[PDB]
Amino acid sequence: VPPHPQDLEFTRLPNGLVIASLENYAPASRIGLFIKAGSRYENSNNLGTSHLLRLASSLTTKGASSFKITRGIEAVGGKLSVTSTRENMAYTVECLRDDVDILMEFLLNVTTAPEFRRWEVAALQPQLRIDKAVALQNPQAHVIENLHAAAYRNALANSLYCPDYRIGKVTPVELHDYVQNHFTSARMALIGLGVSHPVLKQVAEQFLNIRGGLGLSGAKAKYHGGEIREQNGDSLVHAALVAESAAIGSAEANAFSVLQHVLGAGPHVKRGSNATSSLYQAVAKGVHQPFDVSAFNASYSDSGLFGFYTISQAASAGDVIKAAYNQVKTIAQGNLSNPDVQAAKNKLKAGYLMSVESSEGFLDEVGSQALAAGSYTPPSTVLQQIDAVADADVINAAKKFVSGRKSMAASGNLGHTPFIDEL
Amino acid sequence: VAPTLTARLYSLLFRRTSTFALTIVVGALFFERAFDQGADAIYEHINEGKLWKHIKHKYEN
Amino acid sequence: VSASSRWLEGIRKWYYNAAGFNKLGLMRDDTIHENDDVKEAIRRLPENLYDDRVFRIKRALDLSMRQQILPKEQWTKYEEDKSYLEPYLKEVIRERKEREEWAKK
Amino acid sequence: TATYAQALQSVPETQVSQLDNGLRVASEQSSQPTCTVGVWIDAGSRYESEKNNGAGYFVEHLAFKGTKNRPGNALEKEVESMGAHLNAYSTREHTAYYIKALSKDLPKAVELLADIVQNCSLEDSQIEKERDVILQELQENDTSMRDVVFNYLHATAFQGTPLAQSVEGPSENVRKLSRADLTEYLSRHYKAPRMVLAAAGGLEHRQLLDLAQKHFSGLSGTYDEDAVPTLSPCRFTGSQICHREDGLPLAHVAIAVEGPGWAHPDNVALQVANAIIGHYDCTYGGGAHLSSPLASIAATNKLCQSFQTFNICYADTGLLGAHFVCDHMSIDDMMFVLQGQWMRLCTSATESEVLRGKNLLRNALVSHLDGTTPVCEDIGRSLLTYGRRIPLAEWESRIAEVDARVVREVCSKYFYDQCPAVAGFGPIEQLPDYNRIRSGMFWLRF
């Protein structure tokens, strides 16, 4: 018979900073500072700076030294961690509730007091090599990196990981300048779980009144289309094929969201045939060995990519891809049942509600909601918007993929991987 | 008593390398007595009248 | 502001000239004993200060070998003597003393 | 605002009920719009025999591939089409099938889990299909050096006992194991006293019972009486297994002394001491300044790529130690530092670090119980292993008791001058001789 829940409390400061909290009466507290400072904001003279920056979150600040951050936090069983997408960095901190004071102070020192000392920074540059190395051992990491590199000319083309040529080359000035240009008020959102909105607001009005980089979530990402191919010998060919979709927020973007679930995202049932996955079922009909297909759906402030991601043996690469692509084409031609669309809706809705279940997850939603929307938008109203999707819009979503200048990335033994050109 | 005694030894005396060393040192003093006793007395018994320790009573004061 | 603190200064300038590292183009911070705290602060020196430091010492050990001394012109003027290491050294000890307080609790 | 103390009291009573069965049916209500339901069976692989072995795994593989009421393909169809997530795992002691679903779907969620856990239509067709799949898994599992070494450490420490067995079993069993074998395991082990319906999220307990009675009606109803046995105790050896393969680029070692297992109050205190040693990974932010003296020296002297402390529990026993991964010329230095850590903590645990470990443990605990799935798994498992759910406040109490003495004591009891089990894999020339490892298990100065 638990607490009747508190509501989220959400506040836009006139400098354009956004504060949201929830008092769940939890033994732990989570705090995120969500900045519009993701990798799309690097230019061709400073690629990688945000990745070094991602790593630099326990270097010395003005009145909290490197040693103290580590020991101070670890002393309370705290965590401090920093997560980038192509759009955002998200500096989030976690501990027991009695300890928000010590953790908040560390957090603000990192995001607003970075000293970036020559010798600390130099000591850190090998870590981009390790960090990249670890991440780039999922074939997908490369693919989705090249996929973006091929789609866009600019901005979303930039990689989440530092170019090898810049390893050892990103400077303290470049770091300093990145914070100044990007970690301002208009660009930030301070979100807190198991903290109270008065405190958050005080912290924000005291410490996060920063401004004087730039305005715009905006170079504006120029979609261009193309293909990047990488000969591996990995025996399994990974490949993703994609057209320009819809910017996150817009109604059209939910059409794609639902179309993703028609064609089919991940598995639901451990070691299942994925009876409900159209892409899986269409590819299986042709293809008699190990494969995977899933609908791919990325969505950004000012663009997005839709299509699908295949893994096949080298020789089947094309057979898989052509099977997959047809199966989309078949929805564009209008072969789509209403209970199919209904199923994908229950899949999406449940997946959403599922996604926000845990503190880590909820905080992330709210953080990004704040930066992309300038709002909070409750489940009740997200599902409403999901329900609002017409059968026709989903067809049209698929129409758009089929007819639209394409982007491809694939790596493996590419000898029987097609060429766009050839699809 | 006849099984769980190597145990009792180990807990009290052998776990700690201090009490281990203390045991060997305390144990060695008691052994040096009992050995230089016993063995000298074994060496006595195998001669019994060859040695000035037994003759002693002959030529008095 | 003061006659007397110009005198403590005159005593200091004496001892400086008297020490006579100047005489071999050295600066006070060239002469410091290398311990761990010092060693790290040399690590922390920017490229130029480091390269200048190695040259000063190289020039001096050369003179010291040949038992000579600079032209008086080329000696290091007391006023012209920059404690280029000081702030680094201080920051190092500062960081060490923190680690030392943390080790106490 | 709420203190953390206050904040622990706020977390609700895990409600427990018993069916006319053996089947316990347990729930934590929260205001979630979403739930995790499922079945924790007290089947595992400690429970199997040499001929049996890898049955439960073959069952797990069969479990979602179609019932008497819902043939082959169609269970999938129902779960997927309602946006729910069906899932399973087996351990050496525990089998669990669970669904993540919408809360409004807890009816058909339970309906399904019931059908799964009784009416498994183990079609001959499928048991055949499954055998190739399960073999492939064995081939790919051979590549996870970590998965291997923990199987080896189990294989050597428990050397003789059913606990020494893998969960998948040997190649040969998988190929020979028949439908008869499987139904025999099924009918022995999937009885109501040895299983818990567990749920967490947006539900009343009353509905959970109504559904327990409805769909778990008569499992051990007229059953039970004949040839249910209790688990045998498992002999720990302490012993070494070294599988040397210089074709592999890094070494995995996993060292352990014998644990007390699930029930024992000592778990709390050991977990603290463990927390103090902690874990490392070469992607860890900020290296030299880490609290843990292992992890610090590891990072500064590039002594490895990863480590992790552990305490695996079984009934009445368990494996307590650490595992790491490193270069061929690190295996010794890494061994030295880990061992000297254990001993420092045995002899001279200071007051301060123990408060750190205590906090680290509290933070692990609250953070672990985040959302329907973890909490459900912890409901289900706990009832198997403690016969209760132990409330978070109780853990805080149990944690708060521990200090430096409680560490040096409980460490010395488990670690000091004890034969470890060692398992080692890959380029392991420099893995210390067993005598020398065992010498590391005590200080001469003490």
Place this chain on the structure above:
Amino acid sequence: MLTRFLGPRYRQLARNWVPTASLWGAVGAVGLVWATDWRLILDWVPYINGK
């Protein structure tokens, strides 16, 4: 220059190694007693006064 070593932890850690250090002088003296046959002390010990 030993100011470093004065704090709560250090006193905990000394207090930890005290029963051990106690016994190590017990080892060391009794060994010296036995090795020199110290006469003065050993007269006190029953059995061992062999005279």
